[PDB]
Amino acid sequence: PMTLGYWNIRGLAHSIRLLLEYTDSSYEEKKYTMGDAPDYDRSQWLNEKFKLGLDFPNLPYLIDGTHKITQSNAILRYIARKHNLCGESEKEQIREDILENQFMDSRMQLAKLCYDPDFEKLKPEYLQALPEMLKLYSQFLGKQPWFLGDKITFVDFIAYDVLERNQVFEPSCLDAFPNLKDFISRFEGLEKISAYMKSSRFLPRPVFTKMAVFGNK
Amino acid sequence: PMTLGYWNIRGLAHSIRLLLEYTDSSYEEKKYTMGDAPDYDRSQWLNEKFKLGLDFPNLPYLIDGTHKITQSNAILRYIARKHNLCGESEKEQIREDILENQFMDSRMQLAKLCYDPDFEKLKPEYLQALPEMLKLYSQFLGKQPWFLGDKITFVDFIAYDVLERNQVFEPSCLDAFPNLKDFISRFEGLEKISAYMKSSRFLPRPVFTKMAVFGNK
């Protein structure tokens, strides 16, 4: 069937895997692993980096027969598109594009933090800004079940990951935001997701992200 | 008319401004000015920010009728749809997406480099990798006039914003890639784009300057 690739960790691939599972898409996981050390032993990827035939060699990637997708957003939009899980009205499409880009920013903000040696320095800064970021998502989501109304589209999967991350990082921060917390329940509650949340196709070790300082002791 | 807002500088808004001009959309510029005092931090914009009624306030932003759009790629895609400058085929759908994200990443490359003082030492590193990413873009553009075949779409606007910006950094870069070097000429030769570039309202200020907090001397 189609194949998904990324490093052996949740990361950017987490939101994609979830979608592949929600849509029951038959896929294969060919995850590369990294040798954490001062010299960053990433050979695993390098030796097959160009052997794949992708236009822009990068992880994550997906190869659907003749289709070769690169970069999360492209991949997500692809499966979603081939499953009608997109936005219809100009309004839904606008929200859709704003969200995809908005969350991506948030992912990057936290990511840099969890990657910096001076974690302790920026950490307090991030915390005293996290609530204001969330407030915006709270208001937007409102009382609608999903970010695009009654329709659960791909942006929801992206949303779940970004929110779930900040929750694991600081559970107490999203306490003041009911609709957000309950949103995470709507997602995890989805029959197909819950079943997957507890299966072999998941990370044994409780670490959600590893890149340089985090994911290693 | 529409109300496009951003700091008086090229930035992300540059690719949008060109798209608007080309599509003959009567846009209204609301260009804010950055820090004048030593601590060149955001100022005037902050006094407005929330009062605009933006779901997620951030620059740039476009306000068309009842559509308050933020995030560069959201605005870009919005206008693309309205004027049919989007990918029609699934083959073109994956292409526009990959490229969309691929270019934003590349822009980030130069940006991050500019945002830091160590520039003088990091420059050679980035410079040494330039040919690599350009080989990919050239190979992708291949023989075809535009990145999505024979018809101009929005990616060509983000591509120009990235490629051209690179030529400004080091003119020699695209020399080894004639089709990209030619692409630039062709894009700049478009009736509307030409009219816009010769008209007193095109270039605000240089790229690195102000953004990289560099004061000319």
Swiss-Prot record, chains A, B:
Free-text tissue specificity from the UniProt record: Muscle.
GO molecular function: calcium channel inhibitor activity; enzyme binding; fatty acid binding; glutathione binding; glutathione peroxidase activity; glutathione transferase activity; protein homodimerization activity; transmembrane transporter binding
Boundaries of every GST N-terminal domain copy: 1-87
Binding site for substrate: Y115
Marked site (Important for substrate specificity) residue numbers: T209
Record: residues binding glutathione: Y6, W7, R42, S43, Q44, W45, K49, N58, L59, Q71, S72
Phosphoserine PTM sites in chain numbering: S26, S43
Pfam assignment, any one: GST_C
Disulfide bond residue pairs: none
PROSITE patterns found in the cross-reference section: GST_CTER, GST_NTER
Catalysed transformations (reactions): RX + glutathione = an S-substituted glutathione + a halide anion + H(+); 11(S)-hydroxy-14(S),15(S)-epoxy-(5Z,8Z,12E)-eicosatrienoate + glutathione = (11S,15S)-dihydroxy-14(R)-S-glutathionyl-(5Z,8Z,12E)-eicosatrienoate
Residue span, GST C-terminal domain: 89-207
Protein's UniProt keywords contain Lipid metabolism: yes
Effect annotated for changing T209 to C/F/H/I/K/L/R/Y/W: Reduced enzyme activity
A biological process from GO: cellular response to caffeine
Assembly description: Homodimer.
Role description: Conjugation of reduced glutathione to a wide number of exogenous and endogenous hydrophobic electrophiles. Participates in the formation of novel hepoxilin regioisomers.
Family recorded in the similarity comment: Belongs to the GST superfamily. Mu family.
Protein name as annotated: Glutathione S-transferase Mu 2
Organism of origin: Homo sapiens
